[PDB]
Design a protein around this nucleic acid. Structure first.
Ligand SMILES: CC(=O)N[C@@H]1[C@@H](O)[C@H](O[C@@H]2O[C@H](CO)[C@@H](O[C@@H]3O[C@H](CO[C@H]4O[C@H](CO)[C@@H](O)[C@H](O)[C@@H]4O[C@@H]4O[C@H](CO)[C@@H](O[C@@H]5O[C@H](CO)[C@H](O)[C@H](O)[C@H]5O)[C@H](O)[C@H]4NC(C)=O)[C@@H](O)[C@H](O[C@H]4O[C@H](CO)[C@@H](O)[C@H](O)[C@@H]4O)[C@@H]3O)[C@H](O)[C@H]2NC(C)=O)[C@@H](CO[C@H]2O[C@@H](C)[C@@H](O)[C@@H](O)[C@@H]2O)O[C@@H]1O
Ligand SMILES: CC(=O)N[C@H]1[C@@H](O[C@@H]2[C@@H](OC[C@H]3O[C@H](O)[C@@H](O)[C@@H](O)[C@@H]3O)O[C@H](CO)[C@@H](O)[C@@H]2O)O[C@H](CO)[C@@H](O[C@H]2O[C@H](CO)[C@H](O)[C@H](O)[C@H]2O)[C@@H]1O
Ligand SMILES: [Ca+2]
Ligand SMILES: [Ca+2]
Lengths: 177, 208
RNA sequence: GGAGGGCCCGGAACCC
RNA sequence: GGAGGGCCCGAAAGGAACCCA
């Protein structure tokens, strides 16, 4: 089973994207050109492993990768529309409230969404997996949970989105009372 | 030998008396040497005989897919009883056993919140109506939308997502023409879950 | 008219 | 204090977590 890299890895440089070709003999070929930079790990049993760190720009340009071939999903990429939604008035009676980020109209589904405040990553947030919309693109929601007081006292939060179809592959939207 | 898969009932089926929940045991990868398959069902150890098996199905991949459906009782499923499906085929060393049941744990009542379109989205001709459903447990749930008491079909719902507090949440998005939003239509998000009163609740949403 | 381009029949869908 | 009750402690019993006025 040949697996693709993590969207973030392919998105942010700090990380390193890699493909995985999960008496074992490996032979990798990027668009044919056999390469020798792969690396494997320990082992398992019975019937594996081995990873080829790909280059951000290569994977992005849909280069082929085999050892079973694999590459970036095909189709015209579509840029995400990012919308922030404040908590429901009904949620204002709870100790914590939900700050919502809607990300829709993107393709491929490989994306990374984060929340921050004061240039610092927020901790308590969860993002749904991408969901196929009726128009061929995907959408997801990311929920930030914060103490009710951090919201009412004016703190400003930002939803950050990274995706290949975005200018500079990144965008963000803020949210505050 | 062939493969086996046990499917739980539809969340909405276990929650409404007007519906009949059921468990499904599907067997694929069945050979022709012996396309004969036997099913044995057990409810918490005890074997039951009310299962309905459907005749084998010729699959494009030159194989057979055989299905057995077992009717379960609403309260049984919701109370945690386990359902075991034992398959038997000579083209298989030992009989395959699959067991399924509702997830263990204290059920939690989902909190339902409707969110209007973002001001920025109002520049579009199409807008999103959002329904946030959080804090529920187990993850089995059903979500629907209506407008003025009538069925709305243009919505997509995310799968449940495990939250940091041990509970699940999800979002449901209904897409409507901006004009219908601005004209005062009253939209409503309906949720069905065991931990809800009467297993049902709904929140309205309309232009203020 | 171009030049690009998986989830309704190479195309629709999807930067000038 | 009363009653229930998978995704950190505990090897596990079980508990933290999670309706009762
Ligand atoms: C080996 C080979 O080459 N032969 C082929 C067969 O393998 C192939 O059959 C498939 O085998 C796979 C095993 O390799 C199976 O993988 C497992 O898939 C399940 C998810 O299955 C869901 O969803 C599928 C699509 O999302 C759908 O196709 C399946 O039929 C099934 O749908 C659900 O069915 C149940 C049963 O009816 C529904 O139950 C509901 O129950 C309610 C109350 O009980 C109520 O009554 C409802 O009315 C009733 O429907 C349920 O609603 C359906 N849900 C959906 C999604 O619609 C997955 O969970 C498994 O995951 C686990 O196992 C894997 C290992 O693979 C692990 O990695 C995971 O971690 C999990 O542990 C498996 O992935 C696959 O399901 C089999 N598919 C079928 C059709 O049975 C056959 C059939 O191929 C189909 O597709 C094409 C090839 C086509 O050309 C046709 O052949 C055919 O349509 O083909 C060869 O024989
Ligand atoms: C989250 C996760 O578990 N995925 C990790 C792993 O996924 C395997 C996955 O295999 C998919 C299945 O596909 C067919 O439909 C099946 O019939 C099977 O053939 C096959 O299993 O799920 C199975 C369990 O069912 C299991 O083998 C794995 O969970 O795939 C990668 C490792 O095998 C792993 O990705 C890693 O490597 C990539 C590089 O490509 C990333 O850069 C990361 O380093 C890391 O995530 C993946 O996360
Ligand atoms: Ca095509
Ligand atoms: Ca435990």
């Amino acid at each position: 089973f040949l697996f693709p890299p993590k969207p973030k890895d392919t998105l942010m440089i700090s990380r390193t994207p890699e493909v995985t070709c999960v008496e074992v003999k490996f032979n990798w070929y990027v668009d044919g050109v056999e390469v020798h930079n792969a690396k494997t790990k320990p082992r398992e049993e019975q019937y594996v492993v081995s990873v080829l760190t790909v280059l951000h720009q290569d994977w992005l340009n849909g280069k082929e990768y085999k050892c079973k071939t694999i590459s970036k999903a095909k189709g015209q990429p579509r840029e995400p529309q990012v919308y922030t939604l404040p908590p429901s008035r009904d949620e204002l009676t709870k100790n914590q409230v939900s700050l919502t980020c809607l990300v829709k109209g993107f393709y491929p589904s490989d994306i990374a969404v984060e929340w921050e405040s004061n240039g610092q990553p927020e901790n308590n947030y969860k993002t749904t997996p991408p969901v196929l919309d009726s128009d061929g693109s995907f959408f997801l929601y990311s929920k930030l949970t914060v103490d009710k007081s951090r919201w009412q006292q004016g703190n400003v939060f930002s939803c950050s989105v990274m995706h290949e179809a975005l200018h500079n592959h990144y965008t963000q939207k803020s949210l505050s009372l």
